[PDB]
Amino acid sequence: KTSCPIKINQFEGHFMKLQADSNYLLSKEYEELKDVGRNQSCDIALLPENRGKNRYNNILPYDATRVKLSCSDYINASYIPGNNFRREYIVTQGPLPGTKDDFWKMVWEQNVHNIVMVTQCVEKGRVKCDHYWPADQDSLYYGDLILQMLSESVLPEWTIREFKICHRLIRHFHYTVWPDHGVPETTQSLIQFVRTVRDYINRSPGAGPTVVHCSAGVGRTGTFIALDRILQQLDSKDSVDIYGAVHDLRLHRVHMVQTECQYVYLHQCVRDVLRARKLR
Numbered sequence: 001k002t003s004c005p006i007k008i009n010q011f012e013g014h015f016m017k018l019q020a021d022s023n024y025l026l027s028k029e030y031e032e033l034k035d036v037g038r039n040q041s042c043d044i045a046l047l048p049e050n051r052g053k054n055r056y057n058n059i060l061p062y063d064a065t066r067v068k069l070s071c072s073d074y075i076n077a078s079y080i081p082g083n084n085f086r087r088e089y090i091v092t093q094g095p096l097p098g099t100k101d102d103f104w105k106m107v108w109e110q111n112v113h114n115i116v117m118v119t120q121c122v123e124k125g126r127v128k129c130d131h132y133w134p135a136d137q138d139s140l141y142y143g144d145l146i147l148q149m150l151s152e153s154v155l156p157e158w159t160i161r162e163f164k165i166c167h168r169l170i171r172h173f174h175y176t177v178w179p180d181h182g183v184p185e186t187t188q189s190l191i192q193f194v195r196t197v198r199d200y201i202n203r204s205p206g207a208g209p210t211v212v213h214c215s216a217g218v219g220r221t222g223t224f225i226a227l228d229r230i231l232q233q234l235d236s237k238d239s240v241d242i243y244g245a246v247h248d249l250r251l252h253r254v255h256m257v258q259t260e261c262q263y264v265y266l267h268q269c270v271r272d273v274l275r276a277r278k279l280r
């Protein structure tokens, strides 16, 4: 119902059983998540005036968790509380040509110093996200705010950028190989990116919330943040609760972990971590 904790030394077998007879118990568990969070109004997101500010007409923040700019206060963005304090994350859609300034406004207002991006701008012949940051090193106005790229570090599977805004520094983690509605090519890769970001966060004293976005801000964003929470559980507890992590996310935004295969992927991530530790 709201959580499904599994003792780590039973996890291997529990995942086998979930996958038996064509993911029968796994699909059934995943489906139980369907309506979670949905008891809540999206009424502001639905105003006529805000329609142009939403990338997808089915992907709308809840009134109770939406980020407000300080209906001119509207951005398609939701706060996600953490286990210890509110607003661990701000989750958002890929900015649009007419919302890229609202995005940076939000970044500024909310004291964001870390952005994770788990989408590409163009995917399968469709625009998924505006290239909302500077394409080079010359400073650039986004409405009221000036952005300037100080460095761009291309790594095999993600690129790290640092920007000055005004005056503050922002780190931007762009994970470059995650197909929409699907999963990264290996568990290792996303486990390593997630651990990498978490390390930067944990050294970033007194940031705002961490921004995570993909295209709609639900599937890849949801899987990223679920994996974050689950990897931290594995370093803290002798039980792991994938279902409860995804459930927590849904309570705050529609569709987090947006397809079943992304759900299976989280279990395969756990399975792989626990296999390695087994004989260590």
Ligand SMILES: CNC(=O)[C@H](Cc1ccc(NS(=O)(=O)O)cc1)NC(=O)[C@H](Cc1ccc(O)cc1)NC(=O)OC(C)(C)C
Binding pocket: 055, 056, 057, 058, 059, 119, 180, 181, 214, 215, 216, 217, 218, 219, 220, 221, 258
């Ligand atoms: C399965 N796809 C969708 O729901 C996408 C929204 C979406 C969600 C998640 C992701 N993946 S991501 O979260 O990882 O970026 C991309 C796009 N929505 C649309 O394409 C929606 C239509 C839709 C699809 C499916 C559905 O059940 C209800 C309505 N179309 C749509 O919004 O068209 C505009 C852009 C012209 C307004």
Ligand SMILES: [Mg+2]
Binding pocket: 141, 142, 143
């Ligand atoms: Mg402009």
